[PDB]
């Protein structure tokens, strides 16, 4: 309880490079302590460190210290004797198998439990420079010690090196080396990859179905036809900045659309609702099986309500402010890049700004909790998880929800457009369409940002380690000291990235079916990059235990429900499928159309709405034209209700709302049945539980 | 393990009238068995019963048998000695309080558990006529024995007597006397009554709001006025059976409608969604509180899959057939009663037919499970509960779903109506409207059928007991013998009645807001009737333990979700609120209407569709009239798309679908937020859990 004496056996030896034991070699190293003290704060830190070391020795730990060969830094070796291990294995409910004994992971967990009971406070307040366990050896080389297993080398060879990309994950080795959280993260990632392979082959089937009929989609042929889709002259998209345009750029746009907008995409969206349900249910079953195999189950006012309400209101205000900022920044970045290839540059500029404001968002997300922190790890972690996920959701998915549900959805007919305010003429979608723009944005996100994110993940920790080493034989503790410490909530970031990808896959799956395939390739690379940067660059973290992914499971459930709603809204409002269907059924018939049987020909001409120049009148300056046609269902000019919504408009909007209702109800019913018909715990797992 | 000897101490004594003990008086009676044997089957029954009694004696029980004073019926008293009770309280996980000992309820439960382990099989195969515990004393009189508590007398005086209808439920006494199942049923009933009081005062406020504005609803005044609602001549409701009618019966019909069809009803529907959410959440908290207080927490292939699928298919087929039978019988009973008071007679005829087919439905619901019975009580009971509830749901709620969502919804214009087949002209709703018919049906159900059900519950057990006694001092066993035995799933029927009432309250709350009040009165009477018939009429049941209401909780969750959907559909399709709203907002304006500002005057004339006689033509025979109007939004005759749906129809249907979408999404979001914001277990309950 007092700084009676210092760390015993203060001896220096760095000759053995890959020795995890002490100088005698009898006992291994379950933790390492780092401090620099030789150069009024200095004496206070010295006294407090001496007190802490004395407490550690008195509790039963053995501390042996050495100084860095490359001086002023002193490394202290921490080991738990046999008695300490036995007594804290009796205290901490550890599921030992009863028919050296403990793998180094659980030993380091025990010693960190001891440090917490008597550790992060010293490190945070500059007292201790670092404190960590040790790796077995260098990732690329076998350990010099024959006795010590070089399982880090094995994990680098068969699991982390890109050359073994196609091999199955040794999901038992990574959990026995790193811990249950890392192991369950990688198991969840692998299962997610398998389900993505299933959804990806189904989506490729749908894509090929839409590609084989690409030569028969009548509307796309008419758009490409110069005799039908060339005669149609459209109205300018913006004010005084766009000219009158025909419908022949929409030739290529609509070929790609007919590929990406057909019955195959709707079939795939229904299948994807089913597939999300199956993914969630079978992950519940796999999670139960992993819980059994790994034994993850272990155990160890008015003013306050007013403050909670005020903080929630402040968080909501901040979220709304960031929503507006993201929408404005993407609109103004598009405007900047106006004066394709430009999309990629705009995408990377938005990515850099998003990462800057993401760092800002992390800072504000810890600040908001700073004055309301219960300091209990589980609830604080879950609250921070929810808040950070809300922020990331806001950013990433607002950039896409603006295109899907807000862009072009609230404008008017060319005569008297919807003028917002002093700066007005709110942008409408591209000539290709809102759906094609959303598809291109999702493709850019998936492909380009997955590639660049994996490259950054590979390089940034490696770059930091390289620059740290830039500024001869070194022991294990010194080598581990020159490694990036994976800070607080590091695995949280990996889970967050994968949940963002899952939201991208499921929420907007009705736009392009290749999202599961693009996520499949990304995940196949992601397993290896996350394994490699954890194995080689980042310093080894103390193992712990987790029985599930955490708040990410409720987050995924909410994303699934929101995905049903969002896919219904995408097929109804963003997509053009329902107007085509309504024409083919109830407007190519004698009461409205002229065709005898239900067909699709003469659809583009009949859908578009005329607008003659009877309206400043900025349109006459653009050209000598007199009538332009726009993507709306108003009455023709000269009608008694001209520019007002006509019978066709309300028919189509009723069909859209009816489709939303029918699809949502049927999909929710099927999801309810599948979740009901699937036992969340497998029969084999029940049988082995009975034993 | 052999029939070595009979029941010891075979003596006859009936002098003591309310003696719960044996002849000696040292030991109380924990069970009574009924058998008659003095008159090949006889000797086998004698041998089997003697073996059963010998086994009971060997296991530790003491059995004394006496014959009835009024012969051939012999009653056997069953007592558990101190050693057996102690050893089985050690066996069965009983939470005895440590700072005669056991209350007779748990003693009876233990003895019944012993009988089951070594009782129902004998009763089923005529071996034992009946097997029951005994009550302490007569309900209306004190116990003759001074020492014995007269807690049945106390329950009658304070809780079962209708004179104490305003008292609090002695919810601890009823669970300590009857058991945890009955106790939790009555606790749920009391909490349901409290929440019904809340919903009832709110609904009375909404009804008052609709009743005060009864003189300001313009459309009802127009209907009543002979100048507007009298000149409108409507088409005959049926073919060759109904005449041309004006719109003046709809005067009174619309007065009542404007009372029951107003924004107050919509506000109350939203509030009822919130109230169902709060009811479920606070019942979860109350159930946790009762689990803590009462300590209810206790513990003690291809061919098969094909058979399960076949059984599910058979169940679905039977359900559909019963749906058809119920709709056909109600339609044909209405037809019979055609050739008000007639509704009441039709209601009671339907009630009699419903009870007959309910007996048949219980028979078929046990038959379907007989050949697939796992024989484990929990799963088989849950399956039977779900199937029987599905059947009762189909009956009760299909009689109303036909009126709401199908009657008059799929018909045609009077010229060439929807002719189904050889017998055709599908019936349209009454001149008052589908909503008024639904509200009248619900009022009949609630008021008349609740009063009649309570009267039947009071009389039928009492009448059966009277006729049984029809065919001088009688001891306890003989007194209990002449009582109606609450058979299998007896408590299930009470729960089913209350859940049917809950479904009527929640699913159709958008029709009339007095449903919560009518449920409140019914439940205040129901607590007393269920207490009285259980205490005085029905024979005592063996106590059991249950920590929740059972499958009724998932059933109520499903009913809540379906009630959100059903109230949305009722307000949209069955109710006329949305057409009125659409007229007032977007059809009393210059583009369509003539009025300057938004108003509701001239709504009835503008909504109805004209139809001149240009069609057999049964309409000319009925009268000399030439044009009639009908409740549809077709084009006027002579239009280029005459009798086809017009702009008004599609605008109205789009608004109906949009309201369904918006209301469902908002209500589900609010329910999600409230269930999230409310912890399922109370804070005080958590604090006492910590102790
Ligand atoms: Ca990545
Ligand atoms: Ca990653
Ligand atoms: Ca399930
Ligand atoms: Ca009743
Ligand atoms: Ca009852
Ligand atoms: Ca809750």
Residue numbers in the entry:
A (entry chain B), B (entry chain A): 43 to 81, 89 to 119, 121 to 149, 202 to 220, 233 to 414, 446 to 484, 507 to 638, 645 to 788, ...
Which statements did the authors publish about this structure?
TMEM16F, a member of the conserved TMEM16 family, plays a central role in the initiation of blood coagulation and the fusion of trophoblasts. The protein mediates passive ion and lipid transport in response to an increase in intracellular Ca2+. The protein is inactive under resting conditions and becomes activated in response to an increase of the intracellular Ca2+ concentration. Fungal TMEM16 structures have defined the general architecture of the family, where subunits, consisting of an N-terminal cytoplasmic domain followed by a membrane-inserted part composed of ten transmembrane helices (α1-10), assemble as homodimers.
We thus set out to study the mutant F518H by cryo-electron microscopy (cryo-EM) and determined structures of the Ca2+-free protein in detergent and the Ca2+-bound protein in both detergent and lipid nanodiscs. In contrast to F518HnoCa, the two structures of the Ca2+-bound mutant, determined at 2.96 Å in detergent in presence of the lipid PIP2 (F518HCa) and at 2.93 Å in lipid nanodiscs (F518HCaND), adopt conformations that are distinct from WTCa (RMSDs 2.0 Å for F518HCaND and 2.88 Å for F518HCa) with both structures carrying characteristics of an activated state. In this transition, the F518HCaND structure shows an apparent intermediate towards the structure of the mutant in detergent since its coordinates are about halfway on a potential trajectory from F518HnoCa to F518HCa. In F518HCaND, the poor resolution of the α3-α4 pair compared to the rest of the protein reflects its high mobility under the investigated conditions, whereas in F518HCa both helices are found in a single well-defined conformation. In both ligand-occupied mutant structures, the extracellular part of the α3-α4 pair has detached from the rest of the protein, thereby unleashing its tight interactions with α5 and α6. In case of α4, this leads to the straightening of the bent conformation adopted in WTCa by 16° in F518HCaND and 26° in F518HCa. The concomitant conformational change of α3 from WTCa to F518HCaND can be approximated by comparable rearrangements. The tilt around an axis located in the center of the helix parallel to the membrane leads to an outward movement of α3 by 25° at its extracellular and 10° at its intracellular part and a shift along its axis towards the cytoplasm. While sharing general features, these changes are more extended in the detergent structure F518HCa than in the nanodisc structure F518HCaND, which appears to adopt an intermediate on the transition from F518HnoCa to F518HCa presumably defining the activation process. Although the large 2N2-MSP nanodiscs provide a condition that is closer to a membrane environment than a detergent micelle, the accessible conformational space of the protein might be restricted by the size of the disc and the apparent destabilization of the bilayer at the site of the subunit cavity, leading to the observed conformational preference.
